[PDB]
């Protein structure tokens with residue numbers, strides 16, 4: 001019913017598809033970053049997963065933060081010593097936008113082990129706001145997932161959580177995931193989750209909605225399927241640990257399929 | 263953000279919000295009359311306020327002739343200046359001073375139709391307003407009315423998640439919020455607009471409660487106490503109590519006596535208990551009530 005805004009969901013889907021291209025980071029920014037690497041970014045994101053967990057933040061908040069970070073690093077060159085400061089301010093801004101009860105600034109200062117000062121975090125908050133020009137209402141993977149979820153027949157929580165999980169794993173690895181739009185990673189995530197749990201495939205009804213097919217999703221899906229298979233071996237483990245929790249139905253303990261057969 | 267404060271001349275104070283004051287100002291180069299909202303950040307020890315972050319981020323992408331236009335944002339180290347399109351008055355002040363023997367039916371119809379256009383645009387762009395009330399509806403000399411004050415607004419996902427409770431000024435607050443419901447949606451904006459419709463006709467608030475429970479009771483006594491038939495789920499709601507008095511629904515023609523059949527029809531659909539059955543802004547635009555509106559559509563702003 002109204003919680004799924006029947007009268008507006010298509011308008012909204014269309015709008016998000018337009019806004020996801022505008023809020024997209026530059027696919028090749030890390031090569032132009034003299035002092036930071038994909039691996040450092042990965043450590044940062046992993047830590048922001050932990051921060052989200054420590055403060056029981058929404059997953060939406062985590063996704064916004066990563067978006068803010070990647071857009072910022074697209075135009076601003078950053079020394080390794082200051083990457084965490086960008087991340088911290090991004091998490092604060094994302095919290096203030098998405099959270100009912102955002103953690104206070106002091107708690108953000110706290111989790112950085114007093115590497116930075118209250119004033120440093122605050123000054124960085126303004127810089128991100130200026131760089132992004134307050135374009136904070138970005139489409140995320142999750143915004144798309146939750147609408148795709150409405151096409152399950154019937155709803156299945158393992159499917160939902162597993163898709164959430166796979167989408168989260170994608171935030172960690174700028175290569176290759178920077179090359180895909182939220183709507184596509186979400187598509188791939190939903191289809192992989194669906195297949196793993198139920199053996200079913202990306203629904204026709206979502207081909208109607210999205211215009212995407214297994215064909216158009218195929219590249220992304222192959223990457224996500226690798227990321228899933230290797231997930232126990234990745235240097236970064238905070239998402240796996242998080243998705244062991246029963247809140248997410250222990251989905252990180254499911255077995256990835258050895259093949260997609262398509 | 264090409265603006266500079268050097269280019270504005272302040273003209274007079276016009277109002278005061280939470281983090282500051284609003285001046286009518288004049289662009290010294292273009293001639294444009296704007297409203298400047300100041301938001302001091304030096305005072306703020308928690309950095310840029312979340313209200314302001316939501317207002318700016320959300321108003322950026324809401325370009326619509328019935329939504330007040332954010333023209334620019336100036337960001338000093340100690341101050342933040344939102345530059346808005348200037349509208350001379352709000353609906354509350356218009357009802358108090360000039361609408362003494364009432365608003366003409368033509369003008370009420372026009373205002374309602376424009377408010378629905380504005381609100382439909384918000385929902386189409388995944389924004390709940392969450393504070394629709396006459397104070398927050400600005401009117402110009404040309405006959406336009408526009409949604410304003412997006413300090414309480416929020417970007418929603420589909421389906422919606424749990425957001426902040428007890429939102430919306432009490433008199434305009436929907437039953438589902440009053441009953442502590444886990445989830446609320448676009449239907450809370452419609453309820454407000456419905457209260458506003460009634461208010462434009464009578465020039466008094468429809469449900470002037472002095473507490474959460476008093477607000478409910480007033481609503482119940484006007485539309486009847488809802489049960490499982492009119493509203494499936496109601497009795498399972500977190501702050502629903504079996505002890506609630508059971509008032510009979512009085513005939514809707516008694517709620518707003520001067521109102522015609524078309525008017526009553528549309529009002530009832532805006533004030534439907536079940537958020538799922540309540541009319542959407544998009545559907546309400548096609549209601550017969552509006553058949554004879556001809557006021558030319560307001561023009562977008564740059």
Ligand SMILES: NC(=O)c1ccc(I)cc1
Nearest residue numbers: 277284297346347348349
């Ligand atoms: N946009 C405006 O003209 C305006 C905004 C807020 C107030 I309080 C008064 C006027």
Ligand SMILES: NC(=O)c1ccc(I)cc1
Nearest residue numbers: 473474475503505506507
């Ligand atoms: N909050 C109150 O004061 C109140 C709550 C429930 C009833 I039944 C009456 C009053």
